[PDB]
Amino acid sequence: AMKIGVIGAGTMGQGIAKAFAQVEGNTVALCDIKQEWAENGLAKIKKGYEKLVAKGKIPQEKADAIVAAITPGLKENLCADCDLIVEAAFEDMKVKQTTFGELDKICKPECIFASNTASLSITEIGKGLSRPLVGMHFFNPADRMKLIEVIAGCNTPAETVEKIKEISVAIGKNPVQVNEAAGFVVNRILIPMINEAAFIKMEGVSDIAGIDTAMKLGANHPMGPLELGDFIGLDICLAIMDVLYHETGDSKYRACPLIRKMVRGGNLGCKTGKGFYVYNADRTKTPVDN
Amino acid sequence: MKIGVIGAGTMGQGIAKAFAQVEGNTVALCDIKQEWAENGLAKIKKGYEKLVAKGKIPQEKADAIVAAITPGLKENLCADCDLIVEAAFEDMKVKQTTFGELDKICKPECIFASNTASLSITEIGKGLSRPLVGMHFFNPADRMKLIEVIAGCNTPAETVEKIKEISVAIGKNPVQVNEAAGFVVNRILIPMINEAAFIKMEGVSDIAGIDTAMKLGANHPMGPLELGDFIGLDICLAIMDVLYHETGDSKYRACPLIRKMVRGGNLGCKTGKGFYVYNADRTKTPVD
Amino acid sequence: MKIGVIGAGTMGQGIAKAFAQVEGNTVALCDIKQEWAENGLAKIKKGYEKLVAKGKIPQEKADAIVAAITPGLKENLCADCDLIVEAAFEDMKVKQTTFGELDKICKPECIFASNTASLSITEIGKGLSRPLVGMHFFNPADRMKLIEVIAGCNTPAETVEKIKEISVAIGKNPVQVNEAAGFVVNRILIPMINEAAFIKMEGVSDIAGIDTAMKLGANHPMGPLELGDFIGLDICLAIMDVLYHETGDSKYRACPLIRKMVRGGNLGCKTGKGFYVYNADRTKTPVD
Amino acid sequence: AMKIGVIGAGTMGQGIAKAFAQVEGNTVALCDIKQEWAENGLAKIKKGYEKLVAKGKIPQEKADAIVAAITPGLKENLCADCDLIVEAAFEDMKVKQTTFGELDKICKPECIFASNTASLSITEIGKGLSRPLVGMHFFNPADRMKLIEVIAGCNTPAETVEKIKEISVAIGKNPVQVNEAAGFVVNRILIPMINEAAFIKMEGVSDIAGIDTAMKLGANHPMGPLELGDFIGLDICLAIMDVLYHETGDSKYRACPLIRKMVRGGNLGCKTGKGFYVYNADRTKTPVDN
Amino acid sequence: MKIGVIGAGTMGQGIAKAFAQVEGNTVALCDIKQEWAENGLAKIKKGYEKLVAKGKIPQEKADAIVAAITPGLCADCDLIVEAAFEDMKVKQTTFGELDKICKPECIFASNTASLSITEIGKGLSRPLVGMHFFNPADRMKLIEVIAGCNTPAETVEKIKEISVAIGKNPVQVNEAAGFVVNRILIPMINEAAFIKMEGVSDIAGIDTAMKLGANHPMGPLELGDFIGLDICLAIMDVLYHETGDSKYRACPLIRKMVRGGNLGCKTGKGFYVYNADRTKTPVDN
Amino acid sequence: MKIGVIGAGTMGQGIAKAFAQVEGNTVALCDIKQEWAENGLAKIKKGYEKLVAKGKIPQEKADAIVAAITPGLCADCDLIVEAAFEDMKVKQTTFGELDKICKPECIFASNTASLSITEIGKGLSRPLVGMHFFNPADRMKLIEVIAGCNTPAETVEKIKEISVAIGKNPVQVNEAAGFVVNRILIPMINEAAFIKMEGVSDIAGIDTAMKLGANHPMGPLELGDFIGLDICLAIMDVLYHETGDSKYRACPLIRKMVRGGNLGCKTGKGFYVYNADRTKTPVDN
Ligand SMILES: CC(=O)CC(=O)SCCNC(=O)CCNC(=O)[C@H](O)C(C)(C)COP(=O)(O)OP(=O)(O)OC[C@H]1O[C@@H](n2cnc3c(N)ncnc32)[C@H](O)[C@@H]1OP(=O)(O)O
Ligand SMILES: CC(=O)CC(=O)SCCNC(=O)CCNC(=O)[C@H](O)C(C)(C)COP(=O)(O)OP(=O)(O)OC[C@H]1O[C@@H](n2cnc3c(N)ncnc32)[C@H](O)[C@@H]1OP(=O)(O)O
């Protein structure tokens, strides 16, 4: 028995709504700024579940049972008696502080405020609030990845970290406590990997398929690092590298100028059909250095 | 085809099985003492008897593998070798005079390759009469499918192709690398371990947590702290210091935490304590 | 001598007492609102009444000090000023147009000085008709004996000497500085605080311990963590980021720990919590 | 009631011997490699105490009472039933590992092994030993400075840190626990100060007396940073900077090339009569830039 | 061919000279304030007068090229070269304001020093290319030809031919910060400034060192004053911000001098004070 | 004056030429293997022959200077210039072995590229000074005069006069890593190598870029091959180790080529392969 409000209806918010609604006994309020943005979010969840039922990987009764626990709307209307708030709205500081300042008046006092952000300070987002702000960081696709990073901020009490811990296990996830530093644990290790694999390309050491092949056969990684960057989106890798550099001031985390030149040109990876690989119609991918 | 493997230690052992696994090849497993090489082949043959009893290899395929390997001294066994893969102690002067000696023994068409991970292929073969290429296996060499082929600054393109063709002819996937510090795998993978240690050092997360986050967040088979324990923190410290010294770039500065643990003998699995304590059962316990 | 002090805040207050303390000087304490400047002088006069009751100043020396200071607007009080010390909000465009306005008011021989710590003296006075020098007091300006005199890239040697002579004429010790980021004191002293924080961040010692070690090991009056609390961690973060941005050098990267505490409002004494909790008695407690 | 053996009879060892022998109830074995090196150490302690009695700052009975508790000799002869060993021998790794490997056989099992080193790893010094090695770091003059840094190594148990804690209070010092990192607490903060004050000189920002005057009047420090470097010895500042750089790999701790050029020329500060200041006969010091 | 130059400063003026001195080309010269865009064409006749006087040019040739330059015109050019201020939104906006104004099929080229070509041309209808001239653009034989990720080869090659058509040498260079010449030459100026700042030598010694020790036509500090110390700071900063590498941090002595307006030859005081005698004096005497 | 040069390589040979070509000086040329120290004087007559053939020198002048050079002699010189290998203990030992051999009052000078002068002369009886020539020492007009902390002015000035006496220009420079010219010029070669390594351009383009874009007599990569890529690596490494600043990290492509013995003109293959035709080919074609 839990009510969960999810502020943001793009990719992350829809997956976070699905992660709670998969557990029987949870109802999800899928909110956004315009009521029609939330409705497009719930239709996107529905459309996506129609594909799996087709590909035979989920039963239609389950899909229906998931969709039935999600309600689109506005936070003023749906988040009063919410037990947990998980925001996955746009990565802008002032938008977050506004959202949470409103919800602070809307929500009952018992409500837990959490943010899925990966680029901003949990500490600075929840500064003015009347209650603890915590980080509850999901990984795309949030309904299938079992990791949750629980980020403590400078003032986030330990009970608040402990509660998000219990909730993550309740929904079948594995929490990992992180004290707020840029990149947390997973992003701080993983994106500098992608960045090194790009320096190795830029410096002429090896080719794209070779760097990826070496990482797949040499370390038993599921993808190559450059494959992976296309699939994450090179724009997001660049932004994480730049966040890792600006927070620390450490030249160690400088982004590879090759990534920046591709993002400038719009070659963001799988989402643009072209990054280090070209994604064609016939389901084949070829590295851009051929 | 006849291959000479210089070094009867673990790597040399694994490289000899890789070539002897394949029908039609012969391997001379050499080391600096006739006995060393004969102990190398005895470790190989008993690893094969555990496999036979485990039922995962025919008793006659294993015998035919052991039969294809001959221990001895290079002065006796490598003159009509077609390919030499060196896998001996990582010291630049020991590798240079081993390849100086082999330059006089081995027939001209014999190809010279070194399994080195941390020394410069180019420097290795500076003064020789024939090209020197990198042929960097991954342990266990008989089981890992990747082979990094390292072109030196004067290693002709023809030499690099023929080592590619040999790697596939023994069932590997060659990835051509133009020599730089760390090649591909080590240059990505060891700074990874190093970063997880800085995360531990700086109080961001705990050892178990850093490792759980990378396997459940990034789909990695091992956490980076378990893996640096499995590779050996001494191997990880040394690769970091190579990257640092070959580049000049503070980016590759090793994490002082790893340097403190290596100074105390806490190297990982090989000493029974690193980031994890490895107990008498099978569990491992984070020192956290 | 007649001095104009631009800014009736704490620094401007402390700089006006420094000049009015000395017999024969007059000070115009100006700010952008007539009331602000009159509140500045009222804070000054009541600080002097606590001193009189504490018996540490004659009742007539204090009255004569307060009498030498006149609040108002610069357009009214600074035209026949001999020296202008600006001490207003640290924003480059606010300082440039304040000195543009004063360039038309003040008689030509009036000397223009700014108390800025983080902005470029040279940029401050780029387009003016007269030189612009740094005259950087230390709070409390009336009590600290040091004055850093900052030569700009176009500040003549004659201007620098005359500010030296004024500093001693009001009983200070001038230390000539050729403009660079941090001058002398801030460039040594704030990286100090920053380093003690990295030591805390990296788990080397504890907050009380870092502070006790520096006072009993180096003969320092305050620990560096107490001192960053007393200066304000926001002031310390900002100086770090100036040093970093003016140099380009990772050496002066601020410690992320200090950046996290500033984002949470834990700035030190001014907010009642930083590295120390400051309780209702007089004790302070390390957040450690 | 405590017996203390001090391995090293130069400056540090003599001051460490004096710090324990000042406390009634402690007897000090002042050891070195050649019996005559320890005797010169005890005569140096005696000569130095004859000066204070002259300058009127200590009573002669006290000096005599201190000297009487110090015995020069060889560790084989004097350190068997020692309660604590504090080595302040030369800063060389192999010398330390040899000294401690011998003392490990000499000393009773109850004996605490400690090292005053400031440049080497406590962890690497006591690796092969049969008992914990700890760092007990004194500050010249060890008999008058109240700070002791107690350094835990990678394997130094907490009881061993706790015991050196009690002993430091017993002798009137204030211990500070430090987990082993280069420079500990005091040196990592202080010498990079001296180094910055030297960059400021080298870059032409201010003059020698001005940098020192600013630091004395601006921060209320007892000395200027350049004054202080002369008094510490610029060779030692250089070595600490170089140790801080090599251990971290961080360009942040690069030594100022001005310090290195003065050390090369032999201008080590007060001990050579010339560093940033020239130390004349008539008790006056003038900065070398005049 | 018709050619429009955007910017009327040293480089704008020199790029205009470079096109108009080849028989057959016509140039449109432009700037913000028109009085500055005629001040441009004014500095062009003034210099051609001093050379015809010195016998280096025939008056009729000097008069044939200053008649091919029109201060404005851009509606009909076959090629646009912007030599505007080295600020990114400054270049997007101009080029933004410019995709309307020019004929549909006319080539857009920027003379930027180190900025990404690819970001410069993002909202445009047509490919954007890099065509980099070197001070003085009318004498220096080099053109660096920089193509962005979305720059076709027909345009890269159409620039190579135009280059050889006006007596230049076009070297093609891939898009990275500083391209070739500035990435090498500007840190060299920056280093010489650190050498003066740390007192290793004086301004005079460093410059004659590199002239007599390296056979360089200018010392690195005279060369900074001639380039403009504000352009040098910019490129250093762009170098530093593109790579993230403290290797390229500008020398604080150059940031101090740009803040004071000691920019070199354009303001009469850089590392040298330039006198009417035509003699320059190092500011450290 | 009598002059002894220590080292018989390019710089040793050129420094010998620089003294002997001035009427009145005599030089003693030296090296490890004597066959190398006559190989030195062999490369000196061979080059003077090719110039007399090309009419640049009169045979009698070529014959007057090769008669002032004696392969050895050092016992009586008034001035010693070492141009030995750029390894510190290599220079201390030589100079160590040399304070005995030379006359008591003779001036000791090192042609080191970046090493501290002050540490070079520590155990010596006499001041040690820096007298830095530039390849080719007989043409390049510059001498950098470097004094150590314990080098008196009489010796610094005695070098300045000797310099002007052999038609050079002596610039005095304070002891820091790289002095002036190499601290600027060598990272410039190093940068051009990073530019080739990151693929921004090819070897040819970078060099003609800097010739046509900067008016440089050699491109930075030809200049590396002419200096020797082993000397360039050394100076970069010394730069990096003296400052501690990753700004000066050598480019790994130059460390790889030195490891392979691709040193430039002295080994026939650097960034260019040098052919008997007298044409050089970039190794990337
Ligand atoms: C920052 C960026 O983005 C790109 C950049 O700009 S980086 C900087 C690139 N530019 C440079 O580095 C400049 C390098 N410096 C040089 O090449 C030389 O300094 C230099 C060519 C400018 C030297 O000046 P110079 O040789 O005296 O001028 P130059 O025109 O070549 O020859 C001088 C002659 O102008 C000659 N001349 C003949 N015709 C001429 C003409 N049409 N126009 C001008 N001059 C002419 C005359 O012969 C005059 O010499 P005399 O008085 O002795 O007769
Ligand atoms: C690393 C360190 O520690 C210090 C260093 O060395 S750093 C590197 C410093 N050195 C440099 O940078 C070199 C810079 N490069 C240059 O200055 C030019 O490359 C260069 C002078 C070498 C160009 O070569 P050049 O101009 O062709 O040779 P140069 O001798 O000056 O003139 C060529 C002429 O030799 C001339 N010549 C006349 N007399 C001569 C003589 N006594 N000796 C030699 N050449 C003579 C001839 O005129 C020949 O030219 P022609 O065939 O056209 O008639």
Side-chain angles (χ1 to χ4, degrees), chain C residues 161-174:
Chain C
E161 177 79 346
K162 182 66 170 140
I163 297 277
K164 275 176 160 130
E165 301 172 354
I166 288 162
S167 312
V168 308
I170 68 172
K172 313 283 210 211
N173 291 69

Side-chain angles (χ1 to χ4, degrees), chain E residues 11 17 21 48 51 54 56-57 86 111-114 132-136 138-140 144 181-182 185-186 189 217-218 223 226-227 231-232 235, chain F residues 211 213-216:
Chain E
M11 290 302 303
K17 276 142 90 179
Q21 66 187 6
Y48 275 117
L51 248 68
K54 210 218 223 199
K56 289 295 181 133
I57 321 277
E86 176 94 351
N111 178 56
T112 179
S114 56
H132 185 208
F133 291 76
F134 289 85
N135 192 352
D138 44 325
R139 303 246 81 190
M140 299 319 285
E144 282 178 325
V181 174
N182 280 343
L185 189 69
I186 310 303
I189 296 169
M218 292 180 302
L223 176 55
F226 177 74
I227 287 163
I231 306 287
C232 301
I235 286 163
Chain F
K211 283 192 305 208
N215 277 343
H216 285 174

Side-chain angles (χ1 to χ4, degrees), chain A residues 1-23 25-290:
Chain A
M2 209 180 192
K3 282 262 207 163
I4 294 108
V6 170
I7 313 300
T11 312
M12 277 318 291
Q14 288 161 39
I16 285 164
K18 284 192 271 189
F20 283 102
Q22 272 167 355
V23 192
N26 290 325
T27 52
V28 178
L30 180 62
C31 304
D32 220 327
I33 308 160
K34 284 205 270 254
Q35 171 91 33
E36 65 261 39
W37 291 356
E39 299 279 353
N40 301 321
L42 182 65
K44 183 46 192 112
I45 281 165
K46 209 182 200 117
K47 204 166 127 183
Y49 273 135
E50 288 338 293
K51 289 273 82 201
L52 304 157
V53 167
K55 274 182 73 113
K57 288 175 109 63
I58 191 192
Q60 181 78 58
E61 323 158 40
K62 238 293 164 193
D64 282 356
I66 283 154
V67 169
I70 303 167
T71 289
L74 296 179
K75 60 175 161 30
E76 287 70 18
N77 300 333
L78 309 183
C79 294
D81 208 83
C82 271
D83 308 304
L84 170 74
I85 295 297
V86 180
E87 88 82 42
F90 170 48
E91 295 259 37
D92 169 88
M93 189 40 81
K94 262 142 165 151
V95 168
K96 300 229 211 268
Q97 324 193 261
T98 298
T99 297
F100 274 121
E102 280 149 16
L103 283 164
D104 213 4
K105 298 172 186 59
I106 296 161
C107 301
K108 72 205 212 203
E110 297 82 17
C111 189
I112 292 133
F113 283 4
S115 171
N116 178 66
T117 186
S119 335
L120 304 184
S121 167
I122 285 312
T123 307
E124 188 187 354
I125 290 170
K127 185 178 169 2
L129 292 182
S130 98
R131 74 184 90 191
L133 185 281
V134 64
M136 184 178 167
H137 184 233
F138 292 74
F139 292 82
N140 198 352
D143 60 289
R144 289 206 309 218
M145 302 303 278
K146 333 186 107 185
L147 175 63
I148 282 174
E149 294 179 293
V150 184
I151 325 287
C154 185
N155 305 321
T156 310
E159 310 292 80
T160 306
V161 169
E162 169 69 18
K163 281 133 128 152
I164 291 296
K165 256 183 248 172
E166 335 205 314
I167 289 158
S168 316
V169 168
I171 66 175
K173 310 281 196 199
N174 281 106
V176 167
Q177 205 191 290
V178 176
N179 298 294
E180 182 198 321
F184 308 145
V185 184
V186 172
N187 270 335
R188 185 184 165 160
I189 299 174
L190 188 56
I191 304 294
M193 275 199 38
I194 301 168
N195 202 53
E196 194 65 41
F199 268 115
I200 287 168
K201 169 64 207 184
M202 188 184 72
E203 284 160 12
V205 170
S206 185
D207 72 299
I208 284 178
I211 291 152
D212 274 354
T213 291
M215 276 339 278
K216 265 170 316 175
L217 304 172
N220 194 25
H221 284 163
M223 288 177 69
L226 298 174
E227 261 179 310
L228 177 59
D230 274 8
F231 173 81
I232 291 175
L234 297 183
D235 55 319
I236 297 189
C237 298
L238 184 53
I240 303 288
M241 285 316 297
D242 278 338
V243 159
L244 289 167
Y245 177 54
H246 293 137
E247 292 289 308
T248 66
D250 193 348
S251 276
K252 158 184 197 195
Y253 306 106
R254 72 199 179 261
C256 177
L258 176 60
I259 294 186
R260 206 184 290 290
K261 186 216 295 233
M262 296 165 81
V263 171
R264 273 150 177 173
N267 302 328
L268 306 181
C270 286
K271 55 167 145 261
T272 61
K274 168 153 150 142
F276 292 105
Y277 297 89
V278 166
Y279 302 87
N280 307 274
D282 57 15
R283 326 205 106 194
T284 76
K285 61 153 142 52
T286 169
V288 289
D289 56 15
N290 271 42

